[PDB]
Amino acid sequence: NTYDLVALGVGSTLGAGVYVLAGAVARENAGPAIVISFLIAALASVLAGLCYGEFGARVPKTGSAYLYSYVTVGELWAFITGWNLILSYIIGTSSVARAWSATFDELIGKPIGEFSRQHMALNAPGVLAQTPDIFAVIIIIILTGLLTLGVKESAMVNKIFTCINVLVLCFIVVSGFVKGSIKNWQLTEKNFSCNNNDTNVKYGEGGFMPFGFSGVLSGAATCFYAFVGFDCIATTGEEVKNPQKAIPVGIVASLLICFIAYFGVSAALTLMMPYFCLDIDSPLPGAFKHQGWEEAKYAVAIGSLCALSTSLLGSMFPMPRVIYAMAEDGLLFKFLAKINNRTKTPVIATVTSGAIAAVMAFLFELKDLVDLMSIGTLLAYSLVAACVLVLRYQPEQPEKFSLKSILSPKNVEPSKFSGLIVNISAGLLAALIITVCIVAVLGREALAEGTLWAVFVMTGSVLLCMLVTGIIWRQPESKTKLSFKVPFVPVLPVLSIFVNIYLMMQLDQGTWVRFAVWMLIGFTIYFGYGIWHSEEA
Amino acid sequence: QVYNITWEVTNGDRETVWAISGNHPLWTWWPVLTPDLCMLALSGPPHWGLEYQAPYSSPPGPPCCSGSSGSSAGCSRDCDEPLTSLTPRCNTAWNRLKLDQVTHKSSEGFYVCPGSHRPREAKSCGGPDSFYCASWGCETTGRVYWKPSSSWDYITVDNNLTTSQAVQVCKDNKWCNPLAIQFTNAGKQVTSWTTGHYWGLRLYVSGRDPGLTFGIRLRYQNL
Ligand SMILES: *[C@@H]1O[C@H](CO[C@@H]2O[C@@H](C)[C@@H](O)[C@@H](O)[C@@H]2O)[C@@H](O[C@@H]2O[C@H](CO)[C@@H](O[C@@H]3O[C@H](CO)[C@@H](O)[C@H](O[C@H]4O[C@H](CO)[C@@H](O)[C@H](O)[C@@H]4O)[C@@H]3O)[C@H](O)[C@H]2NC(C)=O)[C@H](O)[C@H]1NC(C)=O
Ligand SMILES: CC(C)CCC[C@@H](C)[C@H]1CC[C@H]2[C@@H]3CC=C4C[C@@H](OC(=O)CCC(=O)O)CC[C@]4(C)[C@H]3CC[C@]12C
Ligand SMILES: *[C@@H]1O[C@H](CO)[C@@H](O[C@@H]2O[C@H](CO)[C@@H](O)[C@H](O)[C@H]2NC(C)=O)[C@H](O)[C@H]1NC(C)=O
Ligand SMILES: *[C@@H]1O[C@H](CO)[C@@H](O[C@@H]2O[C@H](CO)[C@@H](O)[C@H](O)[C@H]2NC(C)=O)[C@H](O)[C@H]1NC(C)=O
Ligand SMILES: *[C@@H]1O[C@H](CO)[C@@H](O)[C@H](O)[C@H]1NC(C)=O
Incomplete structure (x- = not known):
């Protein structure tokens, strides 16, 4: 039964986090020291997960931290938690759509992407995306149409996609340890020349920790969002053979497995190709190309497009659900609460959240959306931890x-x-x-x-x-x-x-x-x- | 009689890294030496990142995108990003900016201690392993907040360019940490320069205080 708990945790935790995040962190915030950034983010997550174990223990009805807060702590705290959760889901959908679009665009080819470079330009890199992701908007509209129709996540296909994801992760780790070299963790000024004529590159110090421990900490802050998904162990719902003893072991084992996967994959990525030459749009396939195993780009393309799907759908399916729950409770506007008679689904909430996610994917860079989701999720988790801390000392009310x-x-x-x-x-x-x-x-x-x-x-x-x-x-x-x-x-x-x-x-x-x-x-x-x-x- | 006098500044390996020449009578010409702090580190300690660079070698590292040459292939933006996380060293243009900052910031700085020419009472100061700066009080010159000075040390050392002047020289990917070394009256009376005299220099930083050894020597020939 404990085995089932850890399996549930590993499955629930997003498996697409490393494919999109590893490159962005290892190039912009950390270097190979991303291997450590994932570790801290793991520990930070573990402390949260244990609290969820108690929080979901305080409410017999399983649900989201919104429902728990509303039943236990009251209206305002639950509103803030639910609003942070809404941001998390909306911006996670946006980020995963960004990642999927970038992967497909690189696979099909840059000219397909260069159509945007020909016809569109935001022109405000600091406050707007340097490049708008029109295709991510197309993906989001398609998936919102599917969800409005009543299409729901399929358990069997999700299991298949998680299995293919884990197999491709194992292949990536093996190829990293075979082809990768430790010299890429020891680069100096001699190796500060990148083959591609790409400008404004952040060389940094070089070596294993090119951007210092502050860079490692910023990467860990940005990697905290990847470990999200362990809630399902605290909110398991089914009875457990030894709850206060099986739940924490399951949570910690799931988070350790996720950290092992992320550590191995980021290590492979940073060992095969220099951290400053990583491709933010698609790190893993370009890293494979650099080492001459260009055919592997297809295998990763097979895996990544699967893994990102299991992420995007996972973020997209609950995104309308929180909106519906809050709208019924009156926290959110009632017009989102309404459910279509034809679909039996909250059509208006799904459409609104899809449009917000599409706009965020269109206008904002991948890292910006990632960090916004990270800040919202960290606030939500800090609120949950404070809720457990406070509730432990209140008298049992009538x-x-x-x-x-x-x-x-x-x-x-x-x-x-x-x-x-x-x-x-x-x-x-x-x-x-x-x-x-x-x-x-x-x-x-x-x-x-x-x-x-x-x-x-x-x-x-x-x-x-x-x-x-x-x-x-x-x-x-x-x-x-x-x-x-x-x-x-x-x-x-x-x-x-x-x-x-x-x-x-x-x-x-x-x-x-x-x-x-x-x-x-x-x-x-x-x-x-x-x-x-x-x-x- | 007038000779071709050459004042040479050498790294710790006693290889000439900088020089100036003039037709002057011996012991009459005492110019201001302006070697780059990074030239002293050529083939020097590993910290500076120049331990495999030959004397008179060009400044290593890729150009800053903000340089007078403008943007180019592979140019770095680190020269514009905050330098707080960088190490003060000579290996890159942005590392040279960080070194310039550390040598200019009032709290930080650099101090210099005399070598073999120090009086025997300074024997406790230590050898090259300590850069002759094993403890405070051995430093005779250099720019720090307490303004160390000596009535007997043969040179004084200071930064040559201001921060604003040095920043643009760094962005151009040139040597941009020029020291200004001036002979003291004691140095002007001393005549053992033919054998050369050596000093240690260390940055005043919250850490191990990385340092290097440099030397000054006179060469001369008929003219
Ligand atoms: C007065 O003396 C100076 C210096 O004397 C030099 O050192 C003495 C210890 C002794 O060995 C002398 O014989 C010797 O000349 C004279 O300045 C030097 O002049 C020579 C040429 O006459 C230069 O030789 C080099 O030649 C290279 C091509 O063969 C050239 O690439 C060099 O330039 C590069 O390297 C130098 C350092 O070697 C560097 O400073 C440059 O910026 C460049 O990178 C160089 O021209 C010496 O380099 C000169 N300097 C030194 C320190 O040796 C001077 O000519 C002389 N004047 C008179 C009137 O006699
Ligand atoms: C799951 C249970 C059993 C163990 C939980 C352990 C945590 C409480 C520890 C492990 C690692 C620790 C972190 C390791 C490093 C840092 C960085 C530290 O800040 C610095 O060191 C800044 C240095 C600089 O200025 O560059 C602040 C605390 C923090 C996040 C630590 C907070 C406490 C953490 C998360
Ligand atoms: C980084 O650059 C250094 C020096 O340019 C490389 O070290 C040399 O690599 C060549 C390979 O062509 C060898 O023949 C030399 O023997 C090496 N010398 C030393 C001192 O290491 C190093 O291989 C480069 N690293 C990477 C990852 O490109
Ligand atoms: C070091 O400082 C000296 C003195 O401040 C600089 O010499 C000046 O150089 C400029 C430009 O070449 C001249 O216009 C000034 O007349 C010079 N001043 C003197 C007193 O000679 C020198 O450029 C600085 N840099 C180096 C590397 O020496
Ligand atoms: C390098 O520049 C050439 C033109 O000078 C260009 O054709 C080529 O695509 C560039 N390499 C890249 C973008 O990787």
Whole structure:
């Protein structure tokens, strides 16, 4: 049964993440040190997964983090989680359509792509895609037509596509270890000449870590989105033979298998061809071509187009479903809630989300969409971790204080006073890790210089973080039995939030601006319309 | 009588990496030597990335896309990207920009310590393994915040170009970390330059303080 749990996890986790991400990271953010970027992103994911195990344990009905938040924590928190999940699905659809279109375009040939270069130009690389992906828009419209018609993901074909994906991954790893050479992890100025006449290349230092540990951290922040999919283990639904013991082993084993796959594939990619000469549109096939195994481009083309499909469909199928769920609850506009009588599907929500994903794929680069999805997913996961941390200390439902009551409560089970102090402590602690990450990222050079203000704020914030975590620790936990519990509930959720926020802070200013605008639209919808028409009103 | 005097600056291997010449009487001509800090690193320690480059070799590395030659095949944009993650070294135009920044930033900098010509009281300073800078107080010159100086060291060392002047020279993919070395009065009275004197130079950085050895020597012939 544990074997089945780990299988479910590996299957649910996207297998197309490395095909599109490996090149973009290994060329723009990390080098061969992407091998390490995948590791950190794995660990950051594991901390999240364990929390999900408890979160899905707190609600007997299986569902998304939206439903769990709405039942447990309330309207606003659930709205924010669902809106982040909407962004994750929409932008994941956009990114996977980008990847699939790029792969097919390179396979068919550049002239097919060069039609866009002839007839279209956004002309704003910084805030707009250097090249619009019209064909990804065509893919998204086709798939939205299929989903509106009622076409649904097929289990058997998905299994077949996952098997072919894993076989091609094994072939890629074997070919990397056969043809690849360690010299590509030791490149110097002597090897800083690329055969193709491609300009504005980011040579960097060269070697194994050309862009430094900050580049490794930015890649890990960008690689966090690839490990998404382990939720299905926490939300398994079926009964488990040893829940709090089988669920965590399954989650960790699935994430370790995914890390092994990504490590092997990125290692092969960065060993066969120089990191700075990687093809962002299609890294793996071009890397094969560089080594003279050009025929392999077809095999990868067979695998990649399958794997990306299993990703795109996976993102596309639930994208309307969250919109429908929120619209029924009144959080989102009711016109999305309506379901066609002919299709028995939420046609309007599917069409709207498809159009948004198509626009995002058209106007924005692959890395921009990737980082926007990463920031949204990291915010959602940090919110889930905070939700578990808070709920562990609230009393089971049907201000002034004293230092003795705060530091040494004598009650054996959570009182409402204990719940309020834990709520306040969680809020203060969240703000304080935000400050810690700000100083560690914006004040990073200031910290290296040892300037008094930066070191003072850092030390004070870290010590007060420890103190707030301790005050949470001192409060009694809920005696309620759960099918799963995060082991170190005072520490592990806090470390999860810390890692998630730091990874978010690694993302570019453009990603933060896009995310801020998205959250602003979400809050405008909620405060202007959602509150008043909520079905619980 | 007037001779063809040549002042030569050599790497740690005592191979000439820079020189200037003039028809002057011996011990009367004391020009400002302007060797590049990167020339001193040719065939030098591995950190600088020039340990296999011969003296007088051209600056290695691909051109910056912002150079006066404009964009070209394989040009780097690292010369425009933030340099915070780069190592201060001489191996690339953007690494030379980072070295220029480190040598110019007030907090960072470089310091120089005397070699064999140091007084015996400086024996504790250490040999070439330490670049004669095993501990603070051995440094006699160089640009750092505490402005070290000596009444007996034979040279003073400073940056030659300002940051703004050096940035464009770096983007052109040329040698762009020129030092300015001036003979002190002690150096002007010293006459052992025929045998050459050697100094160690180390960057003041949050780390191992990478360094190199350089030398100054006089050659002369009839003219
Ligand atoms: C006054 O003296 C200087 C220097 O004297 C030189 O060093 C002494 C120790 C001794 O060995 C002298 O015999 C010797 O000349 C004279 O300047 C040198 O002049 C010669 C030619 O007369 C240059 O020889 C080289 O010739 C190469 C082609 O064969 C040419 O490519 C070289 O240029 C490249 O390399 C030099 C360094 O070798 C570099 O500085 C250039 O920028 C270029 O990359 C070079 O022309 C020497 O290089 C000259 N300099 C040195 C340090 O040797 C000077 O001519 C003399 N004047 C009079 C009036 O006597
Ligand atoms: C799943 C359970 C059993 C173990 C979870 C382990 C994590 C809590 C550890 C493993 C690796 C750690 C990370 C490794 C490296 C870093 C980088 C660190 O920042 C730097 O080192 C910055 C350096 C620079 O300025 O360049 C911030 C914490 C973080 C994300 C660490 C946070 C804590 C992590 C995720
Ligand atoms: C990177 O460049 C270096 C030097 O240009 C290469 O090292 C030489 O490679 C040639 C192969 O043509 C050998 O004959 C030499 O013996 C090598 N010398 C040294 C000192 O290594 C190196 O192979 C290049 N690496 C890559 C991946 O192209
Ligand atoms: C080092 O500094 C000197 C002095 O600042 C520079 O010499 C100047 O060069 C410019 C352009 O050739 C002349 O217009 C000035 O008259 C020179 N000044 C003096 C005092 O000679 C020199 O160019 C700098 N760079 C190097 C490599 O020496
Ligand atoms: C290199 O440049 C030539 C024209 O000078 C061009 O035909 C060729 O396609 C270029 N190589 C590439 C784009 O890989």
